């Protein structure tokens, strides 16, 4: 599973940043240490549902003009290989598996079992929220749905559960070959007003903190490290300077490829010899 850190960063940042800027309480919590003036100015400009001004995020070298009132700029940076396993072997799988999904699913009644439906089939069930099925419940997964004994659990006929599971792709089996890569990605906020840049950097730090609970980087992009540069004038040739403070984010991910195996043994030929 080749990793595109930049796209993941963008997808995590955009909705999360919009949600954070949606409400004032979270912003006030974030900007507790800042002075009244800059805090209130940033809140007036960008914060709130009905904010007239808006921030943006995008990759570097855009052929079009880019808004320099407040923008998050991303560039890919360097990368390095840090650790390897014997034969480049990372893991072995019997059934092809895709991404790990989290889905909410209300309990349902079936003639012998309570069940939960899901969007897609199941390759493996990791966890059901606040449940530890015993032998009596006889937890079974049958494609799309997971099921447990009806009678002794009948109080929970409409349990508002949620599920963490894994997609199923194929029944084939193979080996995972790959290594670990230690990658650096640079993120910088741009603004002709330095105070806006400072507040933007603080918001960036908070959303990076919040991201650590995300499933994907919990499973794929562990060992997050941060590093901040100095406030510098990005450009001097305009009528007014652009000010930005670059930040460097580090991640560790496992670049890997699935090598299928067609060998399947189903018969044995134990015979003696004579001389």
């Amino acid at each position: 599973a080749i990793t595109s850190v930049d796209s993941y960063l963008l997808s995590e940042i955009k909705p999360r940043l919009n949600t954070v800027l949606e409400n004032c309480y979270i912003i006030d919590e974030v900007l507790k240490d800042f002075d009244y003036q800059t805090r209130e100015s940033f809140k007036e400009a960008f914060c709130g549902k009905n904010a007239q001004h808006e921030v943006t995020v995008g990759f570097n070298f855009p052929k079009f003009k880019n808004n320099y009132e407040a923008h998050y700029l991303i560039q890919l940076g360097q990368g390095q290989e840090t650790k390897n396993s014997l034969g480049s072997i990372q893991s072995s799988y019997f059934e092809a598996t895709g991404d790990t999904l989290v889905e909410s699913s209300t309990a349902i009644r079936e003639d012998d079992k309570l069940v939960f439906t899901v969007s897609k089939p199941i390759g493996e069930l990791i966890k059901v929220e606040d449940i530890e099925f015993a032998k009596y419940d006889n937890l079974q997964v049958e494609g799309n749905k997971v099921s447990f004994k009806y009678q002794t659990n009948e109080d929970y006929e409409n349990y508002n559960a949620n599920i963490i599971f894994t997609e199923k792709k194929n029944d084939s089996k193979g080996l995972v070959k790959g290594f670990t890569v230690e990658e650096q990605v640079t993120v910088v906020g741009l603004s002709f007003n330095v105070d806006v840049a400072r507040c933007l950097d603080a918001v960036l730090k908070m959303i990076l903190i919040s991201m650590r609970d995300s499933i994907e980087e919990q499973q794929t992009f562990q060992l997050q490290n941060l590093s901040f540069g100095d406030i510098a004038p990005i450009i001097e040739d305009g009528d007014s300077m652009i000010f930005g403070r670059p930040t460097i984010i580090k991640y560790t991910s496992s670049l890997d490829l699935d090598y299928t195996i067609t060998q399947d043994i189903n018969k044995l030929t134990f015979k003696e010899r004579k001389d």
Partner: protein, 86 residues
């Protein structure tokens, strides 16, 4: 016997009240129409009203609504020095 006195302003911000419902606004939608309410002054859609922040623009639609009553919430701390003789 107030020997000396001094006053300080900590906060000075605007808060809005519904004339009939008696509640205080806390949230608005994209159109800036009221979405939520509270009966707590400490939690309200505060608009800064210090010297620098006068003549705002964020809440023009809200202001013109006749159902709402603006209020100037101001917080003060006053220091009084007493000399009471021996």
């Amino acid at each position: 016997s107030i020997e000396k006195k001094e006053e300080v302003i900590a906060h000075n911000e605007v808060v809005f009240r519904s004339l009939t419902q008696g509640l205080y606004v806390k949230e608005v939608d994209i159109y800036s129409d009221v979405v939520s309410y509270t009966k707590d002054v400490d939690e309200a859609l505060a608009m800064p009203n210090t010297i620098n922040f006068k003549n705002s623009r964020k809440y023009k639609k809200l202001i013109m609504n006749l159902d709402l009553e603006p209020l100037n919430k101001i917080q003060k701390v006053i220091y009084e020095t007493h000399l009471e003789g021996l």
